[PDB]
Amino acid sequence: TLSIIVAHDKQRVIGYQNQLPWHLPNDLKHIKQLTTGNTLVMARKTFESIGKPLPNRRNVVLTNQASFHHEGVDVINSLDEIKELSGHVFIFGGQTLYEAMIDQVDDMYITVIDGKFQGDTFFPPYTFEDWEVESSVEGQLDEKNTIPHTFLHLVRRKG
C-alpha cells in the first residue's frame, strides 16, 4: 500500500511544507500513529527540515544528490523506485512529490482545514470522480489545536 500523507487548507495550500506539523499537534500525533512500524518516503528538503531519522520506521529520502548520506536513512533517486518499496509506504513532501504520486497512490490521508494558510504551495486536485471517503473525523479543538480540521481518509475508486 502506497499512501499519501498531507495537510492542507480550503484552497489546497500546504501548511508549513517540509516540516513536521509542530503547529498542528493533532496532526503530528496522526502522522506518528500512521507511519510507525512502516515506511516514510520524504522529499529531501523534508528530511533536512527534520534533520534526523524518525524512530521505529523505515525512513527513505528521495534525492538526485549523489553524496547524500545520513545514517538510518535509505536513499532513492527516482519516483519509480517508490513503487518497489515493500510494506505500507507513506509519501510525505512536498508539492511536486504529491503531483508526481497522486495518480499512483492507493489512498490518501488528508487533514483539511476550515481556514487559510500563508504558503505558495499546493496539493493536487481530487474529486469524488476518483476517490471515495473511507473515513472522515472532525479533529478535537483545544488550546494546542484551535483551527477546525477534519481527518479524511480517501481510497482510489477501484473496479
From Swiss-Prot:
Family: Belongs to the dihydrofolate reductase family.
GO molecular-function terms, A-Z: dihydrofolate reductase activity; NADP binding
Stated role: Key enzyme in folate metabolism. Catalyzes an essential reaction for de novo glycine and purine synthesis, and for DNA precursor synthesis.
Effect of mutating Y98F: Increases trimethoprim sensitivity
Additional facts recorded: There are two DhfR isozymes in S.aureus, this one is plasmid-encoded and is resistant to trimethoprim.
SUPFAM superfamilies reported in the protein's UniProt record: Dihydrofolate reductase-like (SSF53597)
Catalytic activity: (6S)-5,6,7,8-tetrahydrofolate + NADP(+) = 7,8-dihydrofolate + NADPH + H(+)
Residues annotated for NADP(+) binding in this entry: 6-7, 14-19, 43-46, 62-65, 92-97
EC number(s) per entry: 1.5.1.3
Pathway: Cofactor biosynthesis; tetrahydrofolate biosynthesis; 5,6,7,8-tetrahydrofolate from 7,8-dihydrofolate: step 1/1
PROSITE patterns: DHFR_1, DHFR_2
Domain DHFR: residue ranges: 1-156
Protein residues bound to substrate: I5, V6, A7, D27, R57, T111
Enzyme class: oxidoreductase
Any one biological process term the GO annotation gives: dihydrofolate metabolic process
Protein name listed in UniProt: Dihydrofolate reductase type 1 from Tn4003
Domain of life: Bacteria
Any one annotated GO CC term: cytosol
Keyword Transmembrane helix carried by entry: no
Keywords: Antibiotic resistance, Methotrexate resistance, NADP, One-carbon metabolism, Oxidoreductase, Plasmid, Trimethoprim resistance
InterPro entries, alphabetized: DHFR, DHFR-like_dom_sf, DHFR_CS, DHFR_dom
